[PDB]
Design a protein around this nucleic acid. Sequence first.
DNA 1: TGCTTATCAATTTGTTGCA
DNA 2: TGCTTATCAATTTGTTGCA
Lengths: 98, 99
Amino acid sequence: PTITKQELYSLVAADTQLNKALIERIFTSQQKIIQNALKHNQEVIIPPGIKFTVVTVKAKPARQGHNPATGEPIQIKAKPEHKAVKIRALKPVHDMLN
Amino acid sequence: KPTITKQELYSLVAADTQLNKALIERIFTSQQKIIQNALKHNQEVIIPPGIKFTVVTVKAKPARQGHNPATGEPIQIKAKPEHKAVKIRALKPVHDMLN
DNA sequence: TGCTTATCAATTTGTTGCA
DNA sequence: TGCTTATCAATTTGTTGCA
């Protein structure tokens, strides 16, 4: 399972009866549109209805974890504050199973 | 700040690639067909810019008596049963867009 | 009448912030 | 975690203004 993006390019290119090079071409630009938008603190909604959003994640300190299998305490490095791209589904995405 | 809708996204894509807006949509519409066919056939699928689609099941939740603080209304929720729902997940190629 | 009405209004149904 | 959360957002459906 788990159809990859390269398989998706081919899957779409075959259905539309078009070269896969154009398929990646159109998608590569869409990618740039998204990145440049989020870099300018915009919100974007893309097919099939996914909304892109810049958001702030508050810093999290360190805390030493433990591994059950290897039995060695494993420290996680404290994660400072940073921005993260948050996506969330919208109307047609859930409707896809109707 | 304004928000880019998928319609004005088609036009941004259509101008940047120097192609008709109709073909830009004919491909995203096709992408919508493929994605849906996969989920209804219980298969994950990753799309650009690196979003993964998984169909998952949610567990039922009962009713609860709410209260709208603007109204003063005590309002009622309808208990929501078990059902299917698709979940997405931001693969890290998407977080790298802020690099 | 009937609208790509209209920083609509009233509505149910997720999603986020913070104590 | 869950709210008598938020002047939230994102849906869905009803009413009005204006040509």
